[PDB]
Amino acid sequence: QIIKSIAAIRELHQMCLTSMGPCGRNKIIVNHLGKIIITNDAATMLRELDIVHPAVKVLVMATEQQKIDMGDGTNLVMILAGELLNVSEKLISMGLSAVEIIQGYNMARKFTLKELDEMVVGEITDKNDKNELLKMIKPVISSKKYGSEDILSELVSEAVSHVLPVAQQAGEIPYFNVDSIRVVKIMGGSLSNSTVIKGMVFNREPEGHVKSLSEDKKHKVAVFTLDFSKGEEKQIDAMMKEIADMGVECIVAGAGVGELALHYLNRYGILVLKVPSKFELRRLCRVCGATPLPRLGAPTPEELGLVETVKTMEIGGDRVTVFKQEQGEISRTSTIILRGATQNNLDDIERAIDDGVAAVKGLMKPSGGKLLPGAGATEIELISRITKYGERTPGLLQLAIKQFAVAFEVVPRTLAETAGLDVNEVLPNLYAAHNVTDHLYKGVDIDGESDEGVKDIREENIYDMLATKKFAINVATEAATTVLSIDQIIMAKK
Amino acid sequence: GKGQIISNINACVAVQEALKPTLGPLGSDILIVTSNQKTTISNDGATILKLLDVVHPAAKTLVDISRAQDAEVGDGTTSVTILAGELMKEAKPFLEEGISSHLIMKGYRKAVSLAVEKINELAVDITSEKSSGRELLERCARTAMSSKLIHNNADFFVKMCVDAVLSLDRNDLDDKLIGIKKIPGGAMEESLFINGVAFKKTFSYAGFEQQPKKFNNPKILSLNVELELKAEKDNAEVRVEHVEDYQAIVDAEWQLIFEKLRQVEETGANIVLSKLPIGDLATQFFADRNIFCAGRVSADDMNRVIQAVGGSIQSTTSDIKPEHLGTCALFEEMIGSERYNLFQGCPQAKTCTLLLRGGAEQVIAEVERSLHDAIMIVKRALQNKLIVAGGGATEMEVSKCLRDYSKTIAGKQQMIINAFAKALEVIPRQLCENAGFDAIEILNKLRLAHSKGEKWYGVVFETENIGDNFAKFVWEPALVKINALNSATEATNLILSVDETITNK
Amino acid sequence: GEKISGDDIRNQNVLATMAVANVVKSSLGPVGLDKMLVDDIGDFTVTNDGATILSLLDVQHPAGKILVELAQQQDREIGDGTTSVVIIASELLKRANELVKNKIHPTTIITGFRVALREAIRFINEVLSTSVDTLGKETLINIAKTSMSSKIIGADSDFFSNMVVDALLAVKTQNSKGEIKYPVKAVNVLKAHGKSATESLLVPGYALNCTVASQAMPKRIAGGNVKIACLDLNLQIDDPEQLEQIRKREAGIVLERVKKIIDAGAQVVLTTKGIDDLCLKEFVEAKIMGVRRCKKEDLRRIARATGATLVSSMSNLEGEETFESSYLGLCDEVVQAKFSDDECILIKGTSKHSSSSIILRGANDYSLDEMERSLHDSLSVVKRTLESGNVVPGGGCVEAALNIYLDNFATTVGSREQLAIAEFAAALLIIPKTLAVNAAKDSSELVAKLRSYHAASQMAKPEDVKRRSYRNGLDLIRGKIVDEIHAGVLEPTISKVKSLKSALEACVAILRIDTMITVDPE
Amino acid sequence: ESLRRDAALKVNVTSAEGLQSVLETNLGPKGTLKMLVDGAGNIKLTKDGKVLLTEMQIQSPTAVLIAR
Amino acid sequence: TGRQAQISNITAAKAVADVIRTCLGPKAMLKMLLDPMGGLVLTNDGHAILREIDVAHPAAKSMLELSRTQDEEVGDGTTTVIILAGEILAQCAPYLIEKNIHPVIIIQALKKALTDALEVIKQVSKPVDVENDAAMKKLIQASIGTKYVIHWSEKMCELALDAVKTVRKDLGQTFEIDIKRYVRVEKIPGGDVLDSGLQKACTIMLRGGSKDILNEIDRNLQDAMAVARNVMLSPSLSPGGGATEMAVSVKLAEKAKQLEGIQQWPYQAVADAMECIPRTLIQNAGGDPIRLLSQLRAKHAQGNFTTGIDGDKGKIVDMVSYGIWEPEVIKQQSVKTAIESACLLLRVDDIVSGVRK
């Protein structure tokens, strides 16, 4: 139950050790269809991974809940819920019931929330200018691929500034969304060749005669939902002419369009959108403001959209549709053009941007996230506070309080394994550093030179979000007690 | 763990052992066996790894190397691709040892970073000699003949490959722009260059030899719908009262076709090109006008027609414009009772067409790979002119300077950099097994070459001794050698970053 | 029988060698771990010595027999440091099997290591030098502490610097036409159970192993020129008339043969068998010290020391049985030391050759066996140490120092033997590499320092001084830069000269193996 | 892993409870008699405690202590 | 190979410890064994049970050799003395392979913990009169209180003190002890249980209940020779009833944070190993180790040094009124020899058996 059930989790607990840390690594997973997925995020792997033991699915769904809601630093807390079940092995011989186990972690969890507010520093009230965004990207790189931290620094910060409704004074949590920023996969080119376009880019190849003019502008978008043969020639010629009379440069049609209708559209050079997906169709409704009209006819300006200009260029060698606004008011519109060699590196940067953009959305939603030491720095002072918390209120629950502090020792144990450092040497170094203000700006140093000394987090700028830290403990503790609260594993009939 | 990576590297090295006889002109072709009984025998790794059955999922990385080889570089699949995984061979004993590959990935990354500065340092600038596109590209064309089966007869291909790329616009160079027509049978010296759009293969139906092959100035015409009587026409609902009403459908379909062909006839085009095939109804109608007609035009052919005459697909006669009617200076039909359309006098055409002819279908398949690899050499040479000796001997002199930076390490990465320089000695070792030369005799003089001559040490294969390939007029673009380590960096770091694999079902 | 062909038969012995190699590599160095072997009778023993492990190691391949002959050969040459010698022959076959696969001929590696080792003698002699920075007996004291390798009792070597070192200083004799020699086995090792191992006492003389039982034996003895009498003789029907005839004569002859030794002036009598209480009565009136239940092998060392000759039985050239005085030995005094209610005979002042003895104390037999063979193996090292005054720096740092000499030597010879020299120098880096495995250290950090610091003297000109490194070097326990010269760690020249020369010859017979032929046993 | 140890329950009882129902029938003046037959045909029929334990053979090791 | 061979040595140590886990204390229950010959052994003595059990294992006989040494050193109260080494051997290293700690470093940490443990014993212990007969008489009744001779102990204590002081005078320096093997052990069956120089011999008429009772007489009489002998060797008297493990557990936990280093966890690991000894006294007496062991840490530290576990009702009482006291050599000669024997077994890496002699 708890046993074999926890031992089965220890197999994935030791396998996911490389999923976190600046020295962390990725893994290879194969589904039933043969598709390979190489990524360092365990939330994506466990989603497609077939789970046998029933209670393990609860642990998987608990970690996926943090990815949907928070999605920031989930790799660091991914194994946090696994160690909570490991420290319960010592409580087996002691004879502590699951009631005292839940009460021990619940009382220590609420005490931890009060300690995070006392040690929090660096309140950020801006959340707008890119200088505050560059400091938020560094901790994202600490939990992700360490290859290049310079490229993603200017790539993500520039895209957030474009989608941000920059104005004279923007208060009251200006609107920000993850779906507002899309990453376009372009095969070929170095990672440093990735640019940022303030508009929206579509993936498709036009028939020809691409628009060669820019400064002229004046572009519009229209979104749409023997005698018998001679009649179709007059009707199509009339319907295509009435649309061109309104100056419609681009037509969005979800239904089928024959080659005869596309012939008259080539007279004025009218491009058509062949993407059946509703993501690109509904996005233009919030920007250009076009209402889908099932009939063709002569769409009124109420159903017609407004786009800056249309230009087709070859990025990775193929023609793609790129809508870019050179000069003008731009709000809630932006995109990221990603240049990569193989799809293996494209998915790694995709998860970096998806969690990077979600980190900004998760930061702006609360009043503030401030700053908290990350990369296992905060958990060092927590052990000292929890140790004194158990001796503060002696009793039967004090033994469970000590096990709750040992559960935080897996984070420094994991960081030493990814970097090859000896945990036996590093543990007293951190025990002699943060323990007896010099402990607020100090953190553990992970590098080949860490044997000489331990550098602080001030120059490294490695931090953690206070909003996600409070919610990560709440989910990990509740999920751990939920597995322990399961009485028995019984199948279901029919 | 580390034991699983050893079994993963041995599976990748297993195919690399068969791919050793590729780099260099002395390499030997490799035979493959597929399930379709149709195989391609070539030194190219992109074709072999694509048809090779993959067992372990990490072995698919070698397939992605060839895909990234053509996208980032465009050539070197017989040279750079086989060397992308050689760093894992020297790192095999490091896996059994307690050495963590995290520092090994940083060791090779810092080694290839300092090697790029060494490649640009030894790069010779030919612009001081005022070398035009003749002497510069001819010496680079003979270098591209390495790994190719054709050697003694490659002199005819040098004149064809250089003259074909110079006719193409040097501002935009792409393999998709220029056409390649592979014609089985015949001889290799019968290959010629085409100055205009050519048809895919050929169309032979009804009268064939009766069409004269000598024309003056034909005109290109574009069509869309297919022409035929009561066969390929669009189905419609027609009320039929009696059997005699079927004659009205024949007249209604013919008059619909006749009025469209009569209105477009005012253009006076001698060449009729339709998107679909052409039937006998239009054949006899065009026979009275004594004009040529060819259907079944591929989408790749129409894109090149727009670049020359500026035509467009016409589904109806109302949109016909005088600007869509072009012409040509001379038209001659070229083999095995198959007509080949050949256009000339198209200065505005931004695309080219090359006619390839050969007896063996497997040999001409590598010639297509030779054309794609030669264009990438010319493209990177015209953009930046740099002289780098080929044959894999460039890293020989570089390995000496790499050992100098290792002495300044004084750390765990010191022996890691020495393993990177040791991995460079695998290149001449694989070349000695191909030519039967003694590997020890070459490696002994290899370490003694950088102590005296330095500069460029090429290991000339023609004299069966040691020499310099710089005086042999063997030139290679530097961008291929610079990006060669970048392709091996992402390939080595990816496998070392996977300590375990997961396979469901 | 059958025959297995192909080159895979060589790898079968290499994989079998690597299988037993990692077993004995765990006992290398003081940071290593001891192992336990079972005789399959239910009894077990605890020893870290490879000579005992290889003797009890069952290997059906001929490669295992070579390790047994190599371990027994190093016992007479050195006697200790089995993990620092025999294990070297393990990885020697691993790197040699890698080159011979494709471009290297089996004899090329044979001739490659032979020429390299022959020229390495001059390279070793450069590092080899006479004992310096040692005052008096501190030469053996610093070497006695080096026992931490292959022996785990090295932590107690602080107290062992007296009993062990001073044991072989008094055994000095002159024989073989004016040649100072130290006879092996002259030190008698005694075992006892109690107190602690720090209670070991050195006896400047032979100590007989026995126990005093009968109280009739005298408790005190004094005077010089004590005569030792060694005797291996055992001294203790229809009608009863025939029984009385043989009984009255037997009791008379036994008591008469005792008086034959009394007339010879023997102060102490050593009897192999038991002695009756009536025979001890004659020893009290004649002031003779009786001893019974003696070992025959223990009496042989007495003949080589005091000179007392063993007598099988009373006899003479004539029909009369007597005891000649020529069989008696010479010793200064006899001491009775009572250890845990056990009294032993201490013989001092031997005539022919001087000897000594050491009494050991511990908890159980396993604690004594770790103190018995280990200290006995250290005595064999001192035997070869005082023979040649030249010594080498300890800590196993000479393998990394000679690697820079082989780098320049590889360019001198070159040809096809250059690859063998590079692998021979790389095999020397495995010795400190295994030391870092059991010590839970980083090998790449230590080897990088072994290559950087020890090669600085070869690159720089020695005549310009600017030494700036000692090269002498490393540290196993702390992983820091310290010197053994100040820490008192030094090794004798026997640990390398006439040691690794025969160990590197094991690959000569392995590389010439073609196939395997096995005959079915009867 | 912990756990393991052991539990005291009817497993240890099955050895000592086997003689209960066997010796319950012959208890009292209304009880029955047990017989002991050998390979030669000699039959000894009594319920006395001598044959109940010492002369009785059973795989239960508890009966050895009950006989002693 | 590797760490797999050490698992069999630890698993077999825990399997044997589970048999003697409940055998600690005067309330120890009975254990039963079976042999291929068809016999069985039933007794409450853990030393007699482990002596008869013969299993196939390389480290099984090595553990029994430790008891043979302690039989000559103490030999009395095998439930409270001898079998305590089995619980220490299993719990000495609860986390080893998981933490991947060098065993030699652990041994160096066990020596520092054992050295500090011997100092804590001397602090809580107090010297007593070695020549006091009334003081040793209450100590004789401590180990023999497991029988019905408690009321008849006046005859057993009379034969005890008379045989101890008969001769002695055999040591002026390293005690005034002697060998008890020269004393006549011959007993007369039948009746009721109530009915310088060298070592001399003396005997007194003694009668037992039956033949099986004579074997029980040597348990409550010959074993009492070590009661007065432990006082002559170490006049310092220490609290018993499992009170020594509570004081050491507090010192090892406090001194661990002071020493720091890589040995911090192995240093306090001895404390968790010693807490299993009083747990048996709590379970057999009917108490709850969950609530009591938490209170024993505060009471035996701040309250006083006499706080201990009640061997009858299982409550928390002081050893002053508990009436039972353990000499210093009980805990001193046990834990010291237990760690030295445990380190030798932890150093074992690989084992190749089944070859030859």
mmCIF file of N, CA and C in Angstrom, chain E residues 258-292:
data_model
loop_
_atom_site.group_PDB
_atom_site.id
_atom_site.type_symbol
_atom_site.label_atom_id
_atom_site.label_comp_id
_atom_site.label_asym_id
_atom_site.label_seq_id
_atom_site.Cartn_x
_atom_site.Cartn_y
_atom_site.Cartn_z
ATOM 1 N N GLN E 258 27.360 20.564 17.572
ATOM 2 C CA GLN E 258 28.585 21.267 17.933
ATOM 3 C C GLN E 258 29.767 20.810 17.087
ATOM 4 N N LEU E 259 29.879 19.503 16.841
ATOM 5 C CA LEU E 259 31.004 18.982 16.071
ATOM 6 C C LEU E 259 30.854 19.277 14.584
ATOM 7 N N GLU E 260 29.623 19.251 14.078
ATOM 8 C CA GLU E 260 29.309 19.499 12.661
ATOM 9 C C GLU E 260 30.078 18.472 11.832
ATOM 10 N N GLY E 261 30.723 18.862 10.737
ATOM 11 C CA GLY E 261 31.499 17.933 9.938
ATOM 12 C C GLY E 261 30.631 16.930 9.197
ATOM 13 N N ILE E 262 31.309 16.049 8.457
ATOM 14 C CA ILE E 262 30.623 14.988 7.723
ATOM 15 C C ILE E 262 30.160 13.857 8.624
ATOM 16 N N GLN E 263 30.627 13.818 9.869
ATOM 17 C CA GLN E 263 30.285 12.765 10.813
ATOM 18 C C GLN E 263 29.092 13.122 11.692
ATOM 19 N N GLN E 264 28.449 14.265 11.444
ATOM 20 C CA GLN E 264 27.349 14.710 12.297
ATOM 21 C C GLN E 264 26.222 13.684 12.333
ATOM 22 N N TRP E 265 25.784 13.215 11.160
ATOM 23 C CA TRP E 265 24.712 12.220 11.133
ATOM 24 C C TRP E 265 25.148 10.882 11.719
ATOM 25 N N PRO E 266 26.308 10.312 11.365
ATOM 26 C CA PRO E 266 26.724 9.062 12.022
ATOM 27 C C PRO E 266 26.975 9.205 13.513
ATOM 28 N N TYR E 267 27.238 10.418 14.005
ATOM 29 C CA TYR E 267 27.492 10.600 15.430
ATOM 30 C C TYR E 267 26.226 10.371 16.246
ATOM 31 N N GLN E 268 25.132 11.034 15.871
ATOM 32 C CA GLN E 268 23.865 10.871 16.572
ATOM 33 C C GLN E 268 23.129 9.597 16.179
ATOM 34 N N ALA E 269 23.621 8.861 15.179
ATOM 35 C CA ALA E 269 22.989 7.604 14.798
ATOM 36 C C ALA E 269 23.075 6.558 15.900
ATOM 37 N N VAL E 270 24.054 6.676 16.800
ATOM 38 C CA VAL E 270 24.143 5.753 17.926
ATOM 39 C C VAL E 270 22.978 5.963 18.882
ATOM 40 N N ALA E 271 22.494 7.201 19.001
ATOM 41 C CA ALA E 271 21.375 7.485 19.895
ATOM 42 C C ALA E 271 20.121 6.736 19.462
ATOM 43 N N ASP E 272 19.806 6.775 18.165
ATOM 44 C CA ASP E 272 18.637 6.057 17.667
ATOM 45 C C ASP E 272 18.801 4.549 17.811
ATOM 46 N N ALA E 273 20.040 4.053 17.774
ATOM 47 C CA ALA E 273 20.268 2.625 17.957
ATOM 48 C C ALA E 273 20.075 2.207 19.409
ATOM 49 N N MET E 274 20.386 3.093 20.356
ATOM 50 C CA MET E 274 20.241 2.771 21.768
ATOM 51 C C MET E 274 18.807 2.908 22.263
ATOM 52 N N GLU E 275 17.954 3.634 21.536
ATOM 53 C CA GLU E 275 16.568 3.811 21.955
ATOM 54 C C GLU E 275 15.736 2.544 21.804
ATOM 55 N N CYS E 276 16.233 1.538 21.083
ATOM 56 C CA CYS E 276 15.492 0.294 20.922
ATOM 57 C C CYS E 276 15.570 -0.600 22.152
ATOM 58 N N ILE E 277 16.581 -0.417 22.996
ATOM 59 C CA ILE E 277 16.748 -1.220 24.206
ATOM 60 C C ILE E 277 15.623 -0.931 25.200
ATOM 61 N N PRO E 278 15.343 0.329 25.568
ATOM 62 C CA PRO E 278 14.230 0.568 26.502
ATOM 63 C C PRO E 278 12.862 0.306 25.900
ATOM 64 N N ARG E 279 12.746 0.259 24.570
ATOM 65 C CA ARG E 279 11.450 0.016 23.946
ATOM 66 C C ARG E 279 10.910 -1.365 24.297
ATOM 67 N N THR E 280 11.793 -2.358 24.433
ATOM 68 C CA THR E 280 11.348 -3.691 24.826
ATOM 69 C C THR E 280 10.819 -3.695 26.255
ATOM 70 N N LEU E 281 11.470 -2.948 27.151
ATOM 71 C CA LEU E 281 10.993 -2.857 28.527
ATOM 72 C C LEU E 281 9.614 -2.217 28.600
ATOM 73 N N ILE E 282 9.294 -1.334 27.655
ATOM 74 C CA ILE E 282 7.989 -0.681 27.652
ATOM 75 C C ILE E 282 6.919 -1.610 27.093
ATOM 76 N N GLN E 283 7.241 -2.348 26.029
ATOM 77 C CA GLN E 283 6.245 -3.205 25.390
ATOM 78 C C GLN E 283 5.890 -4.395 26.274
ATOM 79 N N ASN E 284 6.899 -5.052 26.851
ATOM 80 C CA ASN E 284 6.635 -6.228 27.674
ATOM 81 C C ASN E 284 5.899 -5.870 28.958
ATOM 82 N N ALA E 285 6.069 -4.645 29.451
ATOM 83 C CA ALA E 285 5.400 -4.210 30.669
ATOM 84 C C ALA E 285 3.996 -3.672 30.421
ATOM 85 N N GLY E 286 3.597 -3.504 29.165
ATOM 86 C CA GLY E 286 2.272 -3.024 28.838
ATOM 87 C C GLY E 286 2.158 -1.541 28.569
ATOM 88 N N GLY E 287 3.276 -0.841 28.367
ATOM 89 C CA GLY E 287 3.249 0.582 28.113
ATOM 90 C C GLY E 287 3.204 0.911 26.630
ATOM 91 N N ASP E 288 3.174 2.210 26.348
ATOM 92 C CA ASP E 288 3.139 2.704 24.976
ATOM 93 C C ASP E 288 4.442 3.429 24.672
ATOM 94 N N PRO E 289 5.306 2.881 23.814
ATOM 95 C CA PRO E 289 6.568 3.572 23.499
ATOM 96 C C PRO E 289 6.377 4.918 22.823
ATOM 97 N N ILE E 290 5.203 5.185 22.248
ATOM 98 C CA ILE E 290 4.986 6.448 21.551
ATOM 99 C C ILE E 290 4.999 7.613 22.535
ATOM 100 N N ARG E 291 4.158 7.544 23.568
ATOM 101 C CA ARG E 291 4.049 8.647 24.516
ATOM 102 C C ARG E 291 5.169 8.645 25.550
ATOM 103 N N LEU E 292 5.652 7.466 25.946
ATOM 104 C CA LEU E 292 6.619 7.395 27.037
ATOM 105 C C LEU E 292 8.000 7.860 26.594
#
